[PDB]
Design a protein around this ligand. Sequence first.
Ligand SMILES: O=C(NC[C@H]1COc2ccccc2O1)c1ccc2c(c1)N(Cc1cccc(Cl)c1)C(=O)CS2
Ligand SMILES: O=C(NC[C@H]1COc2ccccc2O1)c1ccc2c(c1)N(Cc1cccc(Cl)c1)C(=O)CS2
Lengths: 546, 546
Amino acid sequence: TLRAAVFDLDGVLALPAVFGVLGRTEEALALPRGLLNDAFQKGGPEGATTRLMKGEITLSQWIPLMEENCRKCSETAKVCLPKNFSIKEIFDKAISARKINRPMLQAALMLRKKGFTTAILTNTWLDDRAERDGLAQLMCELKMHFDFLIESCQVGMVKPEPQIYKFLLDTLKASPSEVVFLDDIGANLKPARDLGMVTILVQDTDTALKELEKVTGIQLLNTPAPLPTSCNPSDMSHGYVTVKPRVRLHFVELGSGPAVCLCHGFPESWYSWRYQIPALAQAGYRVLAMDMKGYGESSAPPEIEEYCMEVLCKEMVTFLDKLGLSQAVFIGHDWGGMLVWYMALFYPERVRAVASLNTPFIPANPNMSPLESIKANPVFDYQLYFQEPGVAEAELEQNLSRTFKSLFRASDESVLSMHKVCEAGGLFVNSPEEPSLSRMVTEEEIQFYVQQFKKSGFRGPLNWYRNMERNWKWACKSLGRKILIPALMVTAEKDFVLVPQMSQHMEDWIPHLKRGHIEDCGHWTQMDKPTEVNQILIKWLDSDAR
Amino acid sequence: TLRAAVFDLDGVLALPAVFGVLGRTEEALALPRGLLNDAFQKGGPEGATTRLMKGEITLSQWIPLMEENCRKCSETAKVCLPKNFSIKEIFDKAISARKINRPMLQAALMLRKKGFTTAILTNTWLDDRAERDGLAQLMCELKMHFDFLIESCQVGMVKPEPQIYKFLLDTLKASPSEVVFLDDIGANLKPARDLGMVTILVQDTDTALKELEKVTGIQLLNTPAPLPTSCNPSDMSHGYVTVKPRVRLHFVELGSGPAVCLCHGFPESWYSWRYQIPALAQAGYRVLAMDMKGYGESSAPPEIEEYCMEVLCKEMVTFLDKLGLSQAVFIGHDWGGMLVWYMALFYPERVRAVASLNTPFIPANPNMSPLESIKANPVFDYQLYFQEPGVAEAELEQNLSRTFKSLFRASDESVLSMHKVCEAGGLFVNSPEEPSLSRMVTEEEIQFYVQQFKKSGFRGPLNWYRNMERNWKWACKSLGRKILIPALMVTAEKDFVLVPQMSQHMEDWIPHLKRGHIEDCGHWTQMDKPTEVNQILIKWLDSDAR
Ligand SMILES: O=C(NC[C@H]1COc2ccccc2O1)c1ccc2c(c1)N(Cc1cccc(Cl)c1)C(=O)CS2
Ligand SMILES: O=C(NC[C@H]1COc2ccccc2O1)c1ccc2c(c1)N(Cc1cccc(Cl)c1)C(=O)CS2
């Protein structure tokens, strides 16, 4: 019975294989067959390549030793090398062309999901080239998906030496019969088989995956499209900034590059962006996923005034000041989407770009109170139930597991009546006390929001709805302005409160506005349609946020 | 008696003044005198400019309204504007050319240092231009040096309206007689005087500073070169990363741009880099100032093995992995300098560039034990006193205020005998129990290290010296390698343990090595010579770290 899966890098988890380049270069240069390959592994276990793979020497030290081997190999075939020839130039293109083998990673991901201990066992070098970052980015992306990464240059052992295999078994804490081993080199595959491990010679991915699916008894090939990588809270970098004597902001941070500040809605968390954080960091951005004031590890002062848009926006400006950020792109959902449009209206110099999920930008009516305006549309009736301090808190805090299971549901899973919330007298009137688990979330994920909301409850979050007159008066100062910095509006087809139709006149205030629309998507955009959210934002960031 | 100082931005804290550009453009274009200036403030308190300054409209909305005013002003002088003319193009150059008025900032810095409440009162706009970042960077640098920043567009009031002055007094919580007011515009200066405030018409900086020095009774002009901006711990962004079940790393983070990871020595803190963090962030880098394992808010497991170079280097690689950083430039001092050379030797793909302050790179002698090697040089005798667990801890932890006051001293302030530490029997044998305060530190700064060291004491820090055999064996694996990635060696003239001479053969292992040397500098490089450290690193980062 199998319990662990081992994968080589070059030719297995990454294609095209770097080995293949030595050969296709000889074909491209009408050079003798296997000339560059023979020069490569010249000397065997005593040769320059073995020393490089054991970590005795770095890649830049090996480059000249290899050129001398290429010199000698052409000398013993009675032929000569070209003028515009460089080993450095060949390997540079070879390493750069080498991309992740997505289906092979998907299969590794599925095996780990089903309880398998996963590992990478590769013959590699200490890369000190000026362009080593490309490969560093590849390894950093891959490694985080496996329990272990064993590198020949870090262990001073190499494939096919039997010591590295015994080392692999010891680190895996498993017997050979419990191990599947994938390699594109038969010679390197042999000792694993010889030790009693299950082996798969990887030539083409599809066949190798057929072999793997058969031996594990797990469907890996033709399996449904997987969800984007999520976040394990305890594996994240957690950031803390004091924005004023009693107010501290918490955020999760991942990646390098232009700063992207993610702003959640009500009643959410930084965790509501869990499927976006790895995707955006991977796309070349420095993601700062906030716990908005009143939420999670952020301060939650009791006073209503602490939650008016003006103070929330000022504190986010302070957040940037203390972190030393002149700008960040602001991406908001629900209440965060409202904040984000006001960040763009009142502080354009601090906003590189602005994007909103579901929340439209509707200017204030100076000729009507926001409380009268709410009346006009019975969809917002629940907001009047939220006005009285303590009322909604008591109902929402009473059973947290019930609160989040009832709320976080797809468009076809509705369990709550948000209409006539005033009349029925309560948000959970004819709602199950123990609702079913939505297809959007796991029990573990709901339990994350439960633990988060145990610190300060619903007062701070509900206070965001308790400053409509303040916000209205404040918004009225911007009634002569336009949003002229890059902007994106993302509509969700099946959001029954923030309906796409509410965004229709936005172009009158944001003329160069870009759009995105998500079919069959509910209010909880990020968890309902993660793949498409990431696709829309990554595409917009690369075109509009540099 | 004076207690507050107020400064305008344009023409006061930032030069050349943007006003001046309208006029020198007319001269450059042989246009009628004051044409562009008259078109600028056309309409008075009802005009386009007033609306922009009150925040009714953004800069991009004002640009076309201004072009129409330029149209009408040329029409009433019977002349015509050029072909290659653009108001946008003029203001862009004007805002970009405008730099901080360093002596004026220095004077503001000195006034705040002497108990003055400081503030900026400017007539400004909501900048939504594609190039608004330049100005955002200017304001973000400046604002952090003042208690308050009052912007006309944020307050909906403007200079010279008397309401803004009464607003300024209320925010300053001071009476007019307690306020000095600096402005380059007489009209805007007038109401402050009219209210009873002390005023200074700023034409040239020197004269204005003479006027200011006279009225405050504080030397501001010709004053000594100031220390670089430091860090207030409670105003920093604090980061926390779990690198393994029982090990968490803490860091302070500031700025955007290429990641620069700062690694302190023994017995230090992230705070030891306090004069570098704002300087490097300001130079366009994302500074991550570490609390190294065993220090401050970072984990301090008791076991000696947890502090061998191999594990410390592996954990820093994990630190990068969890933060989503493919690389960072590694800058180390003392023990951090040792780590940093081993980061470059064992993980070149993760090191964009490496720099060491004082610590040279000396390869391991495979033919001699590091304990024998230590014997050979009696300068390292204190390291043998550090070997026995508990001994040095008891002495160093006994009086923390005494430990740091005795240690953190300039080259001419020596209070300790590090020679024959073995014989005398103790590190503090003939040392004062209450040493004088070094000219390098304040009581407040020593008290920071005291509070930091109260959490886990000296075991973890001293454990860094307790793995010489492990480190020696590990280092010996790199004996065939070279450091070929960008590298900087910074020597300190008066470091009596890490003498410049120890770095002499480094070029044999680091051929493209760059150097820096600091005259009259002790061991505590960062606090001894902050200005020159920042100058050497900023210059090296811009040439070698992109
Ligand atoms: O309140 C919401 N949005 C916040 C701001 C954004 O700016 C606005 C701009 C325009 C209008 C309103 C604006 O309100 C909101 C939005 C959509 C939905 C929704 C709530 N609810 C109700 C709910 C949610 C959580 C807990 C409870 Cl008890 C009840 C759903 O369950 C899913 S649909
Ligand atoms: O130990 C030091 N360096 C760490 C590594 C770096 O890698 C190395 C590479 C080569 C040699 C040694 C290496 O050692 C060190 C260095 C300089 C000085 C110094 C200590 N001391 C002694 C001291 C400091 C703190 C507390 C106490 Cl009780 C005593 C001073 O007071 C100022 S001069």
